């Protein structure tokens, strides 16, 4: 009766950051120990809570968010951060309590001539609210002339593709990111630790 953290971290394919996937983990026993034991982790940043004490806590719900971004952009997955990824693709609340877990995945998400399948939102007229998912592919209107669904002057495609190539530097290589958000409300707990 263990929680399916394997389906989130050992997933064969990851989502793009604009269409980041969320798994609702509830009514299970969360080991949390398969994490903080694997050495294939570039960053493991926990805010407000400690993963060591996670095995002794109960939560009503646990959220796991999966996507792929560049190494330069992993810095922006943190409370009070700004940038293209933080403002238009994935935003954490300034009082975020949880963990952001990222590791290099150049072996899996890089193709010989470039993967070009992982996308990110380049244009947006306002910043995303925390935990918001904008999967719109509508042509971005940068002027006053209607775009009518075509791309051209003052009408750009809102999404940009990553040039994930194995010969890229460490910054440009793809990093799979999992964000663990812990929820607690005035409801009975459903996700407890091993004890």
């Amino acid at each position, epitope marked *: 009766n263990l929680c399916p953290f394997g389906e989130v971290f050992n997933a064969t394919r990851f989502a793009s950051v604009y269409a980041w996937n969320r798994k609702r983990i509830s009514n299970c026993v969360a080991d949390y120990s398969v994490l903080y034991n694997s050495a294939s982790f570039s960053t493991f940043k926990c805010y407000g809570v400690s993963p060591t004490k996670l095995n002794d806590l109960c939560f009503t719900n646990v959220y796991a968010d999966s996507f792929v971004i560049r190494g*330069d952009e992993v810095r922006q997955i943190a409370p009070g951060q*700004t*940038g*293209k990824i933080a*403002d*238009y693709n994935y935003k954490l609340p300034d009082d975020f309590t949880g963990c952001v877990i990222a590791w290099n995945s150049n072996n899996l998400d890089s193709k010989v001539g470039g993967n070009y399948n992982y996308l990110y939102r*380049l*244009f*947006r*007229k*306002s*910043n995303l609210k925390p935990f918001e998912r904008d999967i719109s592919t509508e042509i*971005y*209107q*940068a*002027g*006053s002339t209607p775009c009518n669904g075509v791309e051209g*002057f*003052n009408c*750009y495609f809102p999404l*940009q593709s990553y*040039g994930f*190539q194995p*010969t*890229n*530097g460490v*910054g*440009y290589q793809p990093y799979r990111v999992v964000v663990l958000s812990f929820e607690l409300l005035h409801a009975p707990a459903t996700v407890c630790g091993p004890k």
Partner: antibody
Amino acid sequence: QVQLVESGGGLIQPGGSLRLSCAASGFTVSSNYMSWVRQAPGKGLEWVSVIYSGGSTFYADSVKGRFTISRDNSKSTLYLQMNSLRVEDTAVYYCARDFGDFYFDYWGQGTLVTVSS
Amino acid sequence: EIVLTQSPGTLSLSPGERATLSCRASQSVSSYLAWYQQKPGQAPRLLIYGASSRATGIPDRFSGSGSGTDFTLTISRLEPEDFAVYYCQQYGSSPRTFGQGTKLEIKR
């Protein structure tokens, strides 16, 4: 058609304040990335600041804490408030439309700012 | 943080020839490079973006080439209006940086 008309440049004493303006035509400023790029006389180009379509701002280290970039949707104008100016800041300042914080497709005519006593 | 070096600093060619301008980066930028043209007394004009894609309204004689750390801008069939200072700009890592420029002169 895109037009960028700049104003506000001139001679200002060191440590003084000066605000540059950039009237924009052919696009909505609130929905585009915009940047200020300066070029010292006889020298190359230097990026100063950028404002995102979502309102986010970024500045170069050589001007951070002294320059503030702002926009006015009702007037369709881009502004750069240059406080605590230094002699090294004397350059022609360009107002350019930014394509996703990558490159500058359209440029203004440029205004000369001279910071001397 | 990342420096762009343009070679040659100055170049002199007769009209109708072919100009090859080089831009070398201190780090790999993965085709995140742009080219600009600045005539004397005027603002830069965007020529190339993405290190290969030509900007709108730019004549076919301009072509972008290169990836990684070395780049090349080639101008074919040099017309008298294609002689100015050319800069390369990278956007692979903040802050965005420009080159020192390559002056293109006319031989006579």
